[PDB]
Amino acid sequence: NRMANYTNLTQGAKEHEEAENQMGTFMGVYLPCLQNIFGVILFLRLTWVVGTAGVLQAFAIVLICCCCTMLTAISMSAIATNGVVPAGGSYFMISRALGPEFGGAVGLCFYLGTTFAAAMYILGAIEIFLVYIVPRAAIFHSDDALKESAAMLNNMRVYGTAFLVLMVLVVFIGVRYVNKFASLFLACVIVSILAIYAGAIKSSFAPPHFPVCMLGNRTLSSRHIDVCSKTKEINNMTVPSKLWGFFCNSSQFFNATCDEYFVHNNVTSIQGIPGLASGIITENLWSNYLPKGEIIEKPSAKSSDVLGSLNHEYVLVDITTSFTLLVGIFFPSVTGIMAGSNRSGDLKDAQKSIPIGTILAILTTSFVYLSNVVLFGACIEGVVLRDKFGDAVKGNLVVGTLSWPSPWVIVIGSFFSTCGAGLQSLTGAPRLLQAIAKDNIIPFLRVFGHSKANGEPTWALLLTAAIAELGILIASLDLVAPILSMFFLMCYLFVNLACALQTLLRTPNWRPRFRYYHWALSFMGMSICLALMFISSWYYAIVAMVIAGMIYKYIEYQGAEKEWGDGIRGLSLSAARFALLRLEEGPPHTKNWRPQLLVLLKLDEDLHVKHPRLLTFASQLKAGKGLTIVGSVIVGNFLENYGEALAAEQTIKHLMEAEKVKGFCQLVVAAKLREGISHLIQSCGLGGMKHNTVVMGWPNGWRQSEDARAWKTFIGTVRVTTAAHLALLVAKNISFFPSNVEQFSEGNIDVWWIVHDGGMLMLLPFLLKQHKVWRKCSIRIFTVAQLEDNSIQMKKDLATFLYHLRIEAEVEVVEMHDSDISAYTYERTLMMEQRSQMLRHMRLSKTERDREAQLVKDRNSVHMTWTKVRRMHTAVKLNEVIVNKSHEAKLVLLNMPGPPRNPEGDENYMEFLEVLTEGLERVLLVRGGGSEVITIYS
Amino acid sequence: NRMANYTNLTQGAKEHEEAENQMGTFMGVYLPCLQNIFGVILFLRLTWVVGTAGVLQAFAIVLICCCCTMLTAISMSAIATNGVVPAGGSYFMISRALGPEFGGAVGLCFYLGTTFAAAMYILGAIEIFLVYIVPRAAIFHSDDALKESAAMLNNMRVYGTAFLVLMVLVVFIGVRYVNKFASLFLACVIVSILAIYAGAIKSSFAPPHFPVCMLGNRTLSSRHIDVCSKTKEINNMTVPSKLWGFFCNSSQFFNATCDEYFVHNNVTSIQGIPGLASGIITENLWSNYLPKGEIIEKPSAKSSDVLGSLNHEYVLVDITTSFTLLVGIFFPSVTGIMAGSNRSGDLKDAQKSIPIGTILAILTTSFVYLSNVVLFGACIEGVVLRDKFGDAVKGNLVVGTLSWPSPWVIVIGSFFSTCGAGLQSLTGAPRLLQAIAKDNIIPFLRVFGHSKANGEPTWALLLTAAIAELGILIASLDLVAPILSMFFLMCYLFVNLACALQTLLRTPNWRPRFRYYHWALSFMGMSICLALMFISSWYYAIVAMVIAGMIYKYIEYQGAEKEWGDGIRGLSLSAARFALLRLEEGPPHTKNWRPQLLVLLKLDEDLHVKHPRLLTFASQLKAGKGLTIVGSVIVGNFLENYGEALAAEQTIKHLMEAEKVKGFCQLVVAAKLREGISHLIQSCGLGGMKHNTVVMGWPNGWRQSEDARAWKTFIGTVRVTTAAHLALLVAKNISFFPSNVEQFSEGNIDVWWIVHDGGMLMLLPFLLKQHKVWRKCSIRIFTVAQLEDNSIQMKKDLATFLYHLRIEAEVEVVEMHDSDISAYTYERTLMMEQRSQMLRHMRLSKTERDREAQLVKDRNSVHMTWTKVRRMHTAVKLNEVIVNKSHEAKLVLLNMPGPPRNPEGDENYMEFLEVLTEGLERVLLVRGGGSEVITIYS
Ligand SMILES: *[C@@H]1O[C@H](CO)[C@@H](O[C@@H]2O[C@H](CO)[C@@H](O)[C@H](O)[C@H]2NC(C)=O)[C@H](O)[C@H]1NC(C)=O
Ligand SMILES: *[C@@H]1O[C@H](CO)[C@@H](O[C@@H]2O[C@H](CO)[C@@H](O)[C@H](O)[C@H]2NC(C)=O)[C@H](O)[C@H]1NC(C)=O
Ligand SMILES: *[C@@H]1O[C@H](CO)[C@@H](O[C@@H]2O[C@H](CO)[C@@H](O)[C@H](O)[C@H]2NC(C)=O)[C@H](O)[C@H]1NC(C)=O
Ligand SMILES: *[C@@H]1O[C@H](CO)[C@@H](O[C@@H]2O[C@H](CO)[C@@H](O)[C@H](O)[C@H]2NC(C)=O)[C@H](O)[C@H]1NC(C)=O
Ligand SMILES: *[C@@H]1O[C@H](CO)[C@@H](O)[C@H](O)[C@H]1NC(C)=O
Ligand SMILES: *[C@@H]1O[C@H](CO)[C@@H](O)[C@H](O)[C@H]1NC(C)=O
Ligand SMILES: *[C@@H]1O[C@H](CO)[C@@H](O)[C@H](O)[C@H]1NC(C)=O
Ligand SMILES: *[C@@H]1O[C@H](CO)[C@@H](O)[C@H](O)[C@H]1NC(C)=O
Ligand SMILES: [Cl-]
Ligand SMILES: [Cl-]
Ligand SMILES: [Cl-]
Ligand SMILES: [Cl-]
C-alpha cells in the first residue's frame, strides 16, 4: 500500500537538469495515459452522438478517430526507442529525436491545445453544476420567450471566470496537493464506467422505469407537469391538469378553444429505457440530422396531420448537425496520448515500457467507446437520446438513467473527474511553456522562464489564465471542442510527418530500433490527420498550417544566427554541413561512375596561368554541372608570399568565369613544386564531395636539355595519382584545343580502346558530344584484339551493346601481335581478377552486367621489359596503325600504359609516350583508377 | 505592305537549335499577345455574366481576374530582363532563368492548360453552328419533354469529334497555311469589337427595335409565335393566335378552360434594347442568382398572384449560379499572356520589347472587358441578358443585337475567330510537349520527341488529339471552362512563387535588371492565384498541387542521377554544392565572430594520437554545433605509406565519435612535419566553409635538450597562423583537462584581459559555460590598465557593459607599470588604428559600437627588445600577480604576445611563455587574428 506516489502529472523542467548533474509499466505509463484520455464527452455528449446519426454512423466516427491516434502512437513509440530517452517528459523526448525546429511547432501546438482544453473542462463542469445539481442558482434567468440559449450562455460566463480564477489559485499555492490526489480522481472515473456496464446488463432483466410523455409523434418536456393523461382526477372532480393549461387558455373549460393538434392525437406514455431485451436497436440504426428548431419525434407512433402551433412545451433540436460537425465534437475524447511519456524520468526501462504502455491504453479506451455506442443505441429510446440536458426524463443525465445504483453516481462522479482533468491541464500547460522558454530557441519568449525557489512557473501561468479565459467568454462546449481539436490534430500531423520524413532521406542519427514500425504507417497516419483537419473548417486549417510553418522557419533562422554568427549567410552554412554529414554512412563504391575533376594549373613567373585552355576543355567536359576544383601551387615561402597568394587567386577566379566554369579555387604556397602538387591530390574536398579524376597538361619541352626537373615532376604526378586510386586525363597540345565559340562543323572523334579501361573510354566522348562545340562530330571506336580471340564475335557483340544504350557509334576491330601491345598486355592477370575480386562487392544481375563495356568485351580467350632474349617496350608498330586511321580526326582518345614498377625506366617511359602520339593534332590520354563501373550512359 | 509574316504562333523547337549553330514591339509582342487573349467569353458568355450578378458584381469579377494576370506579367517581365533571352519561346525562357525543375510543373501545367483550351474553342464553335446558323441539322432532336439539355449535349459530342478530327488533319498537313492566315483571324476580332462600340453609341439616338413578349412578370420564348397580343385579327374573324393554343387546349374556344395565370395578367410587349439614353442601368446594378428551373421575370411589371402551371413556353434558368461559379467561367478570357514571348527568336531588342509589349496588351484587353460590362448593363433589358441562346429575341446573339450593321457581323465573325483560336492551341501544344521531350528531364516522355524532316511533332499530336477528345465527350462549355482555369492558375502560381523565392534567398545567377519590380509584387500576385484556386473547387486544387509537387521532386531525382551517378546519394551532393556556391558573393567581413576550429593532432610512432584530450576540449567548446576539422600529418613517402594513411584515418574517426565530435577528418602524408602542417592551415575547407581558428597543444618537453626541432616547429606554426589572419588557441597541460563525464562541482574561470583581444576573451568562457562540465563555474574577469588611464571609469563601464548583455561575471581592474607589460604594449599604435581602419568597413551605429568589449574599454588615455638602455622582455612581475589570484581556479584564459619581428629571439620567446604560465594547472593561451568583432553573445 506504499505506492501512493501515483502522480499522473507532467515531468517538465526542474526534473531535467537534476538528471544532468522507480516505476513500472502499470503505474508509470499505462495508468497516467488512461486517466488523461477519459473526459467529459463520454458522459455529457456521447449519448447525443449516438442519438443523432444512429448506431451505424456513430460507429464510424469513433473508429476513424481512434485509428487516427493509434497510428500516431506507433510513431510516438518509434521516437522513444531511438535515442537514450531523456528525462523531461514529452517535449524533451521529441526535441532530441526530431532535433530542434520540431520542438517548436509541436510544443507550441501542444501548448495551445491544452490551454483550450482547460477552458473546455471548466465549461464542462459548470454545465454539470447549473443543470443536474442546482437549477436554481442561475443569474440571468430571463423570462420564457423565444431566446433562452442566450440567457444560458451568460450564466456560463460569470460562473466560468469565477471558477477559472479559483483553480489558478490552487496551482499557484497547492500544486503539491493536486499531485497527491491524482489517485482520487482516477477512482471517480473507473467506478463510473463500471456503473454504466452494470445497469446495461441489469436492463435485460429489470428496466429502471423512466417515463416520458408523448402527444403522439411529438415529445413533450417532462418538467413543469405532474400527470401524463390531461385529466387529473382528484376524486370525481375532473379539473383538467397542467398539461391542459399550456395548450389551451386556462382550466375549467372543457367546452372548446384548444389548439388543432391537441384535440386529436391523444396523450400517451412510453418507456424511456426499455432495456437490452426488447430490440429497440432496429430503430436507432439510422441517421436523424435535423435543422435547428425542429421537434423531436419518433416513428412507430400515431399522428393525425392537422398542423398546429408551436408551444413552449416541446423539446427542440438545439443546433443544426451534420456528419462533419460530430467529428469535431467527439475528437477531444481520444486526445491525451502524450501522457504516456510524461513520467519518463522514473521508469526503470523507459524504452520497452513506453511503447507497450501507450498502445495498450489506446485499445482500452477505444473498447470503452466502441462498446458504449452499441450499448446505448440498444437500451435507450431514440427520443431520449436525441436531445441534451435531459428535459424528456425530468432533468437527468441520459447516461445517468442507465446506471444501476442511482443517476447520482455519474452526476457527482463526473464532476470531480472533470475538475480533476481541468487542474491537470492548468498545471501541465505552464510547465511546457517554461520548457520552450528554456533552450533559447525563441528569443521573445525569454521572460516566461521565471521559476521560483522550486520549479513552479510564474509568468507562464498568467498566459494560461488569460488564453483559457478567452475560451470561457466563448461559452457553449459544442463550440470550444472543434477549436482545440484543430490544435491537437496539428501537432499529431507534425510528429507523423517528421518520423516518416527522416527514415526516407536517411537522417544520420535516426535508427528506430522497434518491431512493427514502418515508414508507411507514419504516412498512412498522416493522411488521416489531414483528412479530419480539412473537413472541419478548411479556413481555420490553411491559416493554422502557415503560422505553424512561419514558426518553423523562424527557429531555423534564429538557430543559425547563434551558430554561424549572422543570419541569412548562416542558413546556407547549416544546409551545406547537414548535406555533407549525410554523405558519410552510405555504402560507397557506387556503380555509376562520373568524373569530378581536379584541374592542375601551372603558374610561371609573373604569376599567370600558363595554359588557360585547360579550363576551357574542363568546361566543355562537365558543361556546368558537377563539382570542379582548380588547384595551383606557388613556389616560395608562405611567410613572405602570402600577399601574392591572395592576388593570384583573383586572376584564376576571373579566368574561371570567362571560361564558364562553376567550381572552387584552391591555391597553396609550398617550398617545392612536387610536394605541393602531391598534397593537393590527396587533400582536396571535405569528405564525400572530393575529386575523382586529375586533369593536367602535357610537359611541352621536356626533350629540351639539362633539366630532369621538368619531366620527373610529370612521372611523379602520375605515380601519386595511380597510388591514390584516381583517374588520370592528360591533354597533349592543349594550345590547339578549341575555344567555346568556334564549333567544328564536321569531323570525327576516334577512340582507341586497348584491352583496358573500356567504360571510361565510352563515357567521355558521350559527355563531350552533348556540348555546343562537339555536337556535329561522330564517334568511331577501334578495339585492339589478339589473334587467339574471336574477332568476329567481338564485332557482333560490341555493335549489339551500343544498340541497347543509344550511343550511335561504329565499331571496328583490329588484331595485333603480342610483341606490339606488350606494354599493355603484360600486367593483366595480376590486376584483372583483382578487378573481378572487386566487381561483385554489391548486387548486380545480368541486365546490368551486360551494360559494362569491359565485361561484354571480355568474352574471349620473349621477356619485354622497361629497362635496358630481353627486348624493350617499343611503340613504332602501334603508332603507325593509329596514324593510318586517326589522322585528321579532331580528337583521339587512347588509354596509356602504366609506369614501370621501379625507376631506371622513367626516361624510356617518356619516350614511349612521345613516339605513340606522333603525328596527331589533339590527343587525350586516359588512365583508369581501377574502380570505375558505368551502367547508365546518362 | 511587305510585312505579311505576322505569325502569332509559337516558336518551339527547331528554332532553338538553329540559334545555337527582325520584328518590333507592335508586330512582334503586342499584336500576338492581343490575338490570343480575345476569345469566346467576350461574345458568347459576357452578357450572361453581366445579366446574372448585375453590374456592380460583374465589375468585381473582371477586376479581380485582370489584376491577377497583371501581376504575373510583371514577374514574367523580370524573367526576360535577367539572362540573355534565349530563342525558343516561353518554355526556353523560363527553364533557363528559373533553371530546371520549374521547366517541368510549369511547362506541363501549360501543356494541359492549352490542350483543354483546344477542346473549349471547338465546343464553342459548335454552339455557334448548331444555334444561330442552322438550327435544323441536329441529330438527336428528341421530342419536347422535360429533358432537352441532355438532347443538346449529344449533338455536341457527335459534331465535336467530327470537328476535332478535321482540325488535327489540318495541322498535320497544312501548318504552313495556318501560319500565313494569322492576320486574317486577327481582322475578324478587331472589326467585331468595333461593331459593338458602334451600336452602343447608335442606341443613344436610335435603338434597333428588338421586341420581347411578356405575360406580365414572366418572360416568354419569342420563337414558335407570330403575334404578341393573343387575338390575331385577320379581318373581323377573331380566331385566337398560337399563343392561345399553348396555354389553353386549342383554338375556337373563347368560352373558358384556359389556365389561371393566363386569364389575368395581360399580354404585353416591351423593348429589348432601350439604348444608352433611357436609364435602364438602375435596374441592372444588382444580383439575380436563382436556382435551376426558375422563371426569368422582371421587376417594374404587373402580376396578379394566382399561381399557375408550368408550360413549355417560358424561358428557364439553365444552371444554378453563384459568385464562385462565375469566376471560373470568366477566367479563360484573361489567359494567354505567355504569347508575348513566343516570338522571342525574331525580336531585335528582346529585353525591352517583351516587358512593354506584354503589359500594354493587358491594359488593352482589360479596358475592353471593363467597358463592355458597363455598356451592356446600360443598353440591354435585364431579361434579355439573363439567359443564354437568345430565346427571348427570336434566336439571336444577345451581343449581336447591339451591333450596328447587323447581328450577322458578330455571328460570322466570332466563328472564324473561334476556329482560328482553336487551330492555334492545337499547334502550340504539341510544340511544347516536343520541347519537354527534349532536354531529357523526364525519361518516360522520351518517345514524344519524334520530329519529321522539318519540326512538326508526330506522336505529340496524338496525345493532344486524345486529351482534348476527352474534353469533347464532356459537353457543356460552362463545365470545361473551370477545368482549364485550374491549370492556368497552377502555372501562374509557380512563376510568381519562383520569382519571389529566388530574389529573397539570393540565388546566384538572378539579377532582374528592370524598373518597377519588387519581391512584394510577385508575392501579392501569388496570394491572388491561391485565392481564386481555392474558391473554385478545393478538392481539385489540393490534388492538383501535389501532382504538381510530385512532378517537381521527380525531376530533381532524375536530374541528380545523371549528374552524380546514382540517385539518393546525388540529392545530398547537389544540395551541398548549391549551398556552397551561394556563399560566394555576400559581402564577407561578418560582424558576429564565431570559432570554427582546426584541431592539429600530433601522431607519434605506431600511428596513434598523442593527446586524445584535445578532441574532448574541442567538443566541450563547440557542443556539437558548427564546423570542426581535425588535421593530422604522417611523416613519410606517399608512394609507400598510402596504406597506412587509410588505417590511421579510421582510428582518428573512431576516437572522433567516442568524444562526441561532429566534423571531418583530413590526413596528409608529407616529407617534413613543418611543411605538411603549413599546408593544412591554408588549404582546408571548400570556400566559405573553411576554418577560422587553429587549436594545438603545447610542446611538453622542449626544455629537454639536443632537439631544436621540437620547439621551432611550434614557433613556425604560430607564425604561419598569424600570417593567414587566423585565431590561435594553445592549450597547456592538456592531459589534466577534464573528460566529458566528470563535471566540476564548483570553481572559477579566470580571464586575464591584457590590453588586446577583448571580444574573444569574453565569448570563449560564455560558450564553455553552456556545457555539462563547466556549468557550475563562475566567470571572473581581470583587466590590466595603466597608471595614466582612469581605473575608476573603466571599472564602472565594464560592469555596465556586462549588464546589458546578460553575462553574469565580475570585473576587477589592476594597474601595472609600462616596464612589465612591455611585450604587449609595444606594438599597439602600429596595429591599433589598423584595427580602426578596418572597424568601419560596414555599417554600425552606437547600439552595436557599445557591444564590442574592446571599444568600450578603449575610452582611456627604456627600449625593451626581444634579443640580447637595452633590456629584455621579462615576465617575472606579470606572473606573480596572476598566480596570486588565479591559482586553484580550474581554467585561466590569457592572451599571449606576438612573436618577434625577426629570429634570434625565438628561444627568448619560448622562455617568456614558460615563466608566464608557471604555477597554474590548466592554461589556455588565446591569440586574436586581428579581425574579430563580436556584437551578439548568443
Ligand atoms: C388515440 O387516438 C386515436 C385516434 O387518433 C383514437 O382511436 C380511436 O379509438 C376508437 C375506440 O376504439 C375507435 O373507434 C376509432 O376507430 C379509433 N380511431 C382510429 C383512427 O382508428 C383513440 O381513442 C385515442 N385514445 C384515447 C385513449 O382516446
Ligand atoms: C410526424 O407527423 C407528421 C405529420 O403528421 C409526419 O409527416 C407526414 O409524413 C407522411 C409520410 O409518412 C407524408 O405523406 C405527410 O405529407 C407528412 N406530413 C407533414 C405535415 O409533414 C411525420 O412523418 C411523422 N413523424 C414520423 C417520424 O413518422
Ligand atoms: C392588363 O391587366 C390589368 C389588370 O391586371 C387591366 O387593368 C384594368 O384596366 C381597367 C380599364 O381601365 C381598369 O378599370 C381596371 O381598374 C384595371 N385593373 C386594375 C387592377 O387596376 C388591363 O385591362 C389589362 N390590359 C388589357 C389591355 O386588357
Ligand atoms: C412576380 O410575381 C410574383 C407573384 O405575383 C411576385 O412574388 C410576390 O412578391 C411579393 C412581394 O412584393 C410577396 O408579398 C408575394 O408573397 C410574392 N408572391 C409569390 C407567389 O411569390 C414577384 O415578386 C414578382 N417578380 C418581381 C421581380 O417582382
Ligand atoms: C364520485 O366519487 C365519490 C368518491 O370517489 C363517490 O362517493 C361518489 O359516489 C361518486 N359519484 C358517482 C356518481 O359515481
Ligand atoms: C380562453 O377563453 C377566453 C374566454 O372565453 C377566450 O376569449 C379566449 O379566446 C380563449 N383562449 C383561446 C386561446 O382561444
Ligand atoms: C368587319 O370587317 C369587314 C372588313 O374588315 C367589314 O367589311 C365589315 O363591315 C366589318 N363588320 C362590322 C360589323 O364592323
Ligand atoms: C379543351 O376542350 C375540351 C372539350 O371541351 C375539354 O374536355 C378539355 O378539358 C379542354 N382542355 C383543358 C386543358 O381544359
Ligand atoms: Cl473528453
Ligand atoms: Cl495528446
Ligand atoms: Cl475566351
Ligand atoms: Cl497564358
Numbering used by the authors:
A (entry chain B), B (entry chain A): 100 to 120, 133 to 972, 994 to 1000, 1030 to 1099
Please give the exact wording used by the authors of the publication that reports this structure.
The electroneutral K+-Cl− cotransporters (KCCs) play fundamental roles in trans-epithelial transport, cell volume regulation, and neuronal excitability. The neuronal-specific KCC2 (SLC12A5) and glial-expressed KCC3 (SLC12A6) are essential for normal development and function of the nervous system. Here, we present single particle cryo-electron microscopy (cryo-EM) structures of the full-length human KCC2 and KCC3 at overall resolution of 3.2 and 3.3 Å, respectively. The structures of KCC2 and KCC3 are very similar to each other.
For simplicity, we mainly focused on KCC3 for structural analysis. The TM domain and CTD are connected through a pair of scissor helices, which separate the two TM domains from different protomers resulting in a unique “Central Cleft” between TM domains at the cytosolic side. Both TM domains, scissor helices and CTD are involved in dimerization of the transporter. The TM domain of KCC3 is captured in an inward-facing conformation, sharing the LeuT-fold as the members of the amino acids, polyamines and organocations (APC) superfamily, with TMs 3–5 and 8–10 forming the scaffold domain and TMs 1, 2, 6 and 7 constituting the bundle domain. A marked difference is observed in the C-terminal domain (CTD) compared with Danio rerio Na+-K+ Cl− cotransporter 1 (DrNKCC1), which rotates ~70° clockwise as seen from cytosolic side when transmembrane (TM) domains aligned together. A unique “L” shape N-terminal loop (residues N100–N120) is bound to the entry of the cytosolic vestibule of the transporter, which can be divided into an N lobe and a C lobe. The C lobe, which extends along TM8 and approaches CTD, is stabilized through salt bridges E116-K549 and E119-R886, as well as hydrophilic interaction between H115 and F203 from IL23. The binding locks the transporter in inward-facing state, prohibits the conformation change of the transporter.
